[PDB]
Design a binder for these strands. Structure first.
Ligand SMILES: Nc1ncnc2c1ncn2[C@@H]1O[C@H](CSCC[C@H](N)C(=O)O)[C@@H](O)[C@H]1O
Ligand SMILES: Nc1ncnc2c1ncn2[C@@H]1O[C@H](CSCC[C@H](N)C(=O)O)[C@@H](O)[C@H]1O
Lengths: 284, 183, 284, 187
DNA sequence: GCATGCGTTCTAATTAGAACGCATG
DNA sequence: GCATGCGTTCTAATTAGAACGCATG
């Protein structure tokens, strides 16, 4: 009846938010296998977690035997690229072409990792994508995952808009979202010394810099020494809920770091979703 | 994915689920179905987007699941990968449970409507390379045990262009060693 | 009779190494007036010390009255730009032209800040510049400061070569330099996880990236995942002895941060020079 | 500072330190210097690079320190600012200590040899703007100097700046020396 | 009504990387 | 000792920033 550390498969791992959230919850992590192709994302996860993450490269090269050998897995998580699923891009290619079809790789590996019937062991999974997709894509995704998504907007627990869909079977996914004592809910809470926030919440941050100045006006969000300014990398990390300097890696500059942060998960949203896992696995 | 031969007296009429293309009139020619009862052993459906597991399960048990792309000279209604992923979706609903091992087969055929990397998605999802059976050709992924031209030839053949049922059916026969034969 | 906090004038302050070293020594800092021109150096000092530094801009606009009102000062420090004094640059307009003549501004304000003769009050000062200058320039500088310089190379206490001249009247400037328990003397001691140092000590780091690849070979100094790489900004901070992420400010990238760090002081050398001040001023 | 006038009987012969240029034969004309003293009260030196405070202190006391650029031309080897910074260096050595306040004066003149950036540092270091003394008469020759001094003796730069292009004038410096008759012996 | 956004694509800026250099030590 | 270095200049790219876009609601 004792608990063991959690064994995780994480596809499209990005900057290892999944691992970070688990460690922040005190869950003992026994294995974290991450599929990721971008070299600078991999550098972040590598350096910031001192080699605990096993990187396995392109999701499309993971084999049925790979899932057998690297497993068993207790938790299968992923969030696939939304370049072709979002409305934000005019040249959507949809769920079936371009990179939208990488979702089926998640669907595919999820089924390999699932325990066989008769095995009543715990097994949790979660898949995330953006809301700005068409109903046909949202319908087909939850045709393949056999369940419907929860929508969670980080505006409730962070200083920024970002509404996402989450499918999965984690305990309590549909429950209400409540802020914790240490959630930085206003933009001012995330700025460095001697900087003034013009807004309390900022529009959804993407990988491109034009998402940082707000609204139709395209106004710089910060005032410093009387002049307008954009947000800083440390301030972006704070908005998304990452540790300060999490992406200060591999000589990356403003652009590189915004790219990684803009496509990442909001840490406090993942914490909320992952928190019911504490009672199924080993704890620090 | 491999089954012992069944004795002839216990062979039973196959139950098949054919998606997108219909092989009913096809398969009766080989005596797998009995031309007679309208409520056949074969269930046909083309628009599978809103089919649920509970649909496939209440459509009764199946011994053969067959899916195929639309023919080449045809309107591409949906992306060519769509027929693949959907075929893979319901095939999983149709499989027998681990604790009930019964001869169970599946076939997927393409009309050369799938480009190269679509084929690499096909063979990782159906866990096998296809076999190219041929002027016109199709390629099949199948677990049934039946299964010489440059793909240069095939790829320039494809461009200048009718489902070629002619060609798929001969790979269907080895299922006679599991199901009843009608004469 | 008791000791009070130290009041500092810092000319050409750069990224506030002076203040950082003092706070790291436990010396109470009552006033720190810094003249500095570059906006991103100023951002570093501002944010990293939360407004304790009083910035006063161009050294050439500080007036004799300014020194009266901002003072008295206990410590006057400065390190003038070496664009025109180093032999590293073929175009050197010397001590008397270009920016080399900013030294005389230090000499000038030093005299304004000196106590009158009736005042036997404690008063310390220090001026730094590169060794790679003409003998005539070195002669004239210490004609104007009336004293000769100590040479201290950071290699005794750092993972990098950096030989500098220090004039001044601080206690014990001529004493031998000994490494302390927490000095990172080898390059390996400053790299991030999963990176291999090829050398133990690195050649002098300047503002331009060609100073990072070593010697005649111009070899990348690090191996990561089997391929060679240059140093990372956090590793540069560590070589110079700054806190990690000290320059992770104001959206600066690899180039900007190397510029600030390349013209900086070696923190452990300044600590050595400033350490005898603990017995003349208040301590926390 | 302002210095009260001397009664005429207490006036003494000036002790002066003149750098770069020599004003010896000049200053004798106004009787501040006297032609009898073989050990003159004027000390002249040109290469001041290795002059120390202890040199200045024993060559003095001094009551007047005078420095000047080379004349326009001369093929100056040294940067024009060099004469300024060195003059400022020694002047500090020569000043009286605070607890011994005596009449003490200093003068620096430039031959139009200093650019605008040099002149702005000139006036930051000598704590005053210069005054422009021109030469022009009935034949309207053109020649000028600018002086910095604490001596109570004390035009378009279009004209000056184009004057310079085409090419020592004691005539113009000498008249500013005579307000010092109120502090030192006359003839 | 009509405001938004885990982006691709142009061009115009910054920026990055090597040559270039000889006194000083 | 004969290599080194608190850099400026050139060019080759890197990258930055602004229009462009329409379905999801
Ligand atoms: N073929 C592939 N195999 C594995 N990862 C891939 C991939 N193609 C794209 N990716 C990666 O999938 C990620 C989708 S963005 C997801 C980021 C992640 N949710 C986070 O929390 O940081 C990107 O990092 C992209 O590099
Ligand atoms: N006219 C001026 N007034 C004040 N600072 C100036 C200046 N001209 C140049 N500077 C600054 O003087 C500095 C010389 S480099 C000195 C760096 C400093 N010792 C440190 O430890 O970081 C540079 O930051 C430069 O921007």
């Amino acid at each position: 009846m004792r608990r063991r550390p959690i064994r995780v498969l994480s596809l499209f791992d990005g900057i290892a938010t999944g691992y970070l959230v688990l460690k922040e919850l005190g869950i003992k992590v026994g294995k974290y296998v991450a599929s990721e192709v971008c070299e600078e994302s991999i550098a972040v996860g590598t350096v910031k977690h001192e080699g605990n993450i096993k990187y396995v490269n392109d999701v499309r090269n993971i084999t049925k035997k790979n899932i057998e050998e690297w497993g068993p897995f207790d938790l299968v998580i992923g969030g696939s690229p939304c370049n072709d699923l979002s409305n934000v891009n005019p040249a959507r290619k949809g769920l079936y072409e371009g990179t939208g079809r990488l979702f089926f790789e998640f669907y595919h590996l999820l089924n390999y990792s699932r325990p066989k019937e008769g095995d009543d062991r715990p097994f949790f999974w979660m898949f995330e994508n953006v809301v700005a997709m068409k109903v046909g894509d949202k319908r087909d995704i939850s045709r393949f995952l056999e369940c419907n998504p929860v929508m969670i907007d980080a505006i409730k627990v962070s200083a920024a808009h970002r509404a996402r869909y989450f499918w999965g079977n984690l305990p309590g996914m549909n429950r209400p979202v409540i802020a914790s004592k240490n959630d930085k809910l206003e933009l001012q809470d995330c700025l460095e010394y001697n900087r003034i926030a013009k807004l309390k919440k900022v529009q959804t941050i993407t990988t491109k810099s034009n998402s940082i100045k707000q609204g139709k006006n395209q106004l710089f969000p910060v005032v410093m020494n009387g002049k307008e300014d954009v947000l800083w990398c440390t301030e972006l990390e704070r908005i998304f809920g990452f540790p300060v300097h999490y992406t200060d890696v591999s000589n990356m500059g403003r652009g590189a770091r915004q790219k990684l942060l803009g496509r990442s998960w909001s840490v406090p949203v993942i914490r909320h979703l992952f928190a019911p896992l504490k009672d199924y696995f080993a704890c620090e | 994915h491999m089954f012992e031969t069944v004795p002839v007296w216990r062979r039973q009429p196959v139950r098949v689920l054919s998606l997108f293309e219909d092989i009913k009139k096809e398969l009766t020619s080989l005596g797998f179905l009995e031309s007679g009862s309208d409520p056949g052993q074969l269930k046909h459906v083309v628009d599978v987007t809103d089919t649920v597991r509970k649909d496939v399960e209440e459509w009764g048990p199946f011994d053969l699941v067959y899916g195929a792309t639309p023919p080449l000279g045809h309107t591409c209604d949906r992306p060519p990968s769509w027929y693949l992923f959907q075929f893979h979706r319901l095939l999983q609903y149709a499989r027998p449970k681990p604790g009930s091992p019964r001869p169970f087969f599946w076939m997927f055929v393409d009309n050369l409507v799938l480009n190269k990397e679509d084929l690499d998605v096909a063979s990782r999802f159906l866990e096998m390379e296809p076999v190219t059976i041929p002027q016109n050709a199709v390629r099949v992924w199948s677990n049934i045990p039946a299964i010489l031209v440059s793909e240069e030839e095939l790829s320039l053949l494809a461009q200048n262009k009718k489902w070629p049922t002619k060609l798929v059916k001969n790979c269907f026969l080895p299922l006679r060693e599991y199901f009843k034969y009608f004469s």
